[PDB]
Amino acid sequence: GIGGVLLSAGKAALKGLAKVLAEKYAN
């Protein structure tokens, strides 16, 4: 585990960032 790599960077997506997901990443 690191943090802002994809791991807990992903854990944050669970909550909010799965929003930004469809925007940038899922884009």
Side-chain angles (χ1 to χ4, degrees):
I2 295 177
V5 44
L6 77 315
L7 206 305
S8 48
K11 259 77 282 290
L14 284 26
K15 312 297 175 175
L17 286 305
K19 72 87 55 184
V20 65
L21 232 291
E23 326 239 273
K24 336 273 64 155
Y25 310 73
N27 180 87

Coordinates of all heavy atoms in Angstrom, one line a residue:
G1 N 0.8 -1.2 0.0 CA 0.0 0.0 0.0 C 0.8 1.3 0.0 O 1.9 1.3 0.7
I2 N 0.4 2.2 -0.8 CA 1.1 3.5 -0.9 C 0.2 4.6 -0.4 O 0.3 5.1 0.7 CB 1.6 3.8 -2.3 CG1 2.7 2.7 -2.7 CG2 2.2 5.2 -2.4 CD1 3.2 2.9 -4.1
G3 N -0.7 5.0 -1.4 CA -1.7 6.0 -1.1 C -2.3 6.5 -2.4 O -3.3 6.0 -2.9
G4 N -1.6 7.5 -2.9 CA -2.1 8.2 -4.1 C -1.6 7.5 -5.4 O -1.2 8.2 -6.3
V5 N -1.6 6.2 -5.4 CA -1.1 5.5 -6.5 C -2.3 4.9 -7.3 O -2.4 5.1 -8.6 CB -0.2 4.3 -6.1 CG1 -0.7 3.6 -4.9 CG2 0.1 3.4 -7.2
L6 N -3.2 4.2 -6.6 CA -4.4 3.6 -7.2 C -5.1 2.9 -6.1 O -6.4 2.6 -6.2 CB -4.1 2.7 -8.5 CG -3.5 1.3 -8.2 CD1 -2.4 1.3 -7.2 CD2 -4.7 0.3 -7.9
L7 N -4.4 2.5 -5.1 CA -4.9 1.7 -4.0 C -5.9 2.4 -3.2 O -7.1 2.2 -3.4 CB -3.7 1.3 -3.1 CG -3.9 0.0 -2.3 CD1 -5.1 0.1 -1.5 CD2 -3.9 -1.1 -3.3
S8 N -5.5 3.4 -2.4 CA -6.4 4.1 -1.5 C -6.9 5.3 -2.2 O -7.9 5.9 -1.9 CB -5.7 4.4 -0.2 OG -4.5 5.0 -0.4
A9 N -6.2 5.6 -3.3 CA -6.6 6.5 -4.3 C -7.9 5.9 -4.9 O -8.8 6.6 -5.3 CB -5.6 6.5 -5.4
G10 N -8.1 4.5 -4.8 CA -9.3 3.9 -5.2 C -10.3 3.8 -4.1 O -11.5 3.9 -4.3
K11 N -9.8 3.6 -2.9 CA -10.6 3.6 -1.7 C -11.4 4.9 -1.6 O -12.5 4.9 -1.1 CB -9.7 3.4 -0.5 CG -9.7 2.0 0.1 CD -8.8 1.1 -0.7 CE -9.6 0.6 -1.9 NZ -10.7 -0.3 -1.6
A12 N -10.8 6.0 -2.1 CA -11.5 7.3 -2.1 C -12.6 7.3 -3.1 O -13.6 8.0 -2.9 CB -10.5 8.4 -2.3
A13 N -12.4 6.6 -4.2 CA -13.3 6.5 -5.3 C -14.6 5.8 -4.8 O -15.7 6.2 -5.1 CB -12.8 5.8 -6.5
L14 N -14.4 4.8 -3.9 CA -15.6 4.1 -3.3 C -16.6 5.1 -2.8 O -17.8 4.9 -2.9 CB -15.1 3.3 -2.1 CG -14.4 2.0 -2.3 CD1 -13.7 1.9 -3.6 CD2 -13.4 1.8 -1.1
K15 N -16.0 6.2 -2.3 CA -16.8 7.2 -1.6 C -17.2 8.3 -2.6 O -18.4 8.4 -2.9 CB -16.0 7.7 -0.4 CG -15.4 6.6 0.4 CD -16.4 5.8 1.0 CE -15.8 4.6 1.7 NZ -16.8 3.8 2.5
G16 N -16.3 9.1 -2.9 CA -16.5 10.2 -3.9 C -16.0 9.9 -5.2 O -16.7 9.9 -6.2
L17 N -14.7 9.7 -5.3 CA -13.9 9.8 -6.5 C -14.3 8.8 -7.6 O -13.9 8.9 -8.7 CB -12.4 9.6 -6.2 CG -11.7 10.8 -5.5 CD1 -11.9 12.1 -6.3 CD2 -12.2 11.0 -4.1
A18 N -15.2 7.9 -7.3 CA -15.8 7.1 -8.4 C -16.6 8.0 -9.2 O -17.1 7.6 -10.3 CB -16.5 5.9 -7.9
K19 N -16.8 9.2 -8.8 CA -17.5 10.2 -9.6 C -16.5 10.7 -10.7 O -16.8 10.6 -11.9 CB -17.9 11.4 -8.6 CG -16.7 12.3 -8.1 CD -16.4 13.4 -9.0 CE -17.6 14.3 -9.3 NZ -17.3 15.3 -10.3
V20 N -15.3 11.0 -10.3 CA -14.3 11.7 -11.1 C -13.8 10.7 -12.1 O -13.2 10.9 -13.2 CB -13.1 12.2 -10.3 CG1 -12.4 11.1 -9.7 CG2 -12.2 13.1 -11.1
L21 N -14.0 9.5 -11.6 CA -13.7 8.3 -12.4 C -14.2 8.3 -13.8 O -13.4 8.3 -14.7 CB -14.4 7.2 -11.6 CG -13.6 6.0 -11.3 CD1 -13.2 5.3 -12.6 CD2 -12.3 6.5 -10.6
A22 N -15.5 8.5 -13.9 CA -16.2 8.4 -15.2 C -15.9 9.6 -16.1 O -16.3 9.6 -17.3 CB -17.7 8.3 -15.0
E23 N -15.2 10.5 -15.5 CA -14.8 11.7 -16.0 C -13.5 11.7 -16.7 O -13.3 12.2 -17.8 CB -14.8 12.7 -14.9 CG -15.8 12.3 -13.8 CD -16.8 13.4 -13.5 OE1 -16.5 14.3 -12.6 OE2 -17.9 13.4 -14.1
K24 N -12.5 11.3 -16.0 CA -11.1 11.3 -16.4 C -10.7 9.9 -16.8 O -10.2 9.7 -17.9 CB -10.3 11.7 -15.2 CG -11.1 12.5 -14.1 CD -11.1 14.0 -14.4 CE -11.7 14.4 -15.7 NZ -12.3 15.8 -15.6
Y25 N -10.9 8.9 -15.9 CA -10.4 7.6 -16.0 C -11.2 6.8 -16.9 O -10.8 6.2 -17.9 CB -10.3 7.0 -14.6 CG -9.8 7.9 -13.6 CD1 -10.5 9.0 -13.2 CD2 -8.5 7.7 -13.0 CE1 -10.0 9.8 -12.2 CE2 -8.1 8.5 -12.0 CZ -8.8 9.6 -11.6 OH -8.4 10.5 -10.6
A26 N -12.5 6.7 -16.5 CA -13.5 5.9 -17.2 C -13.8 6.6 -18.5 O -14.4 6.0 -19.4 CB -14.7 5.8 -16.3
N27 N -13.5 7.9 -18.5 CA -13.6 8.7 -19.7 C -13.0 8.0 -20.9 O -13.8 7.6 -21.8 CB -12.8 10.0 -19.5 CG -12.9 10.9 -20.7 OD1 -13.8 11.7 -20.8 ND2 -11.8 10.9 -21.5

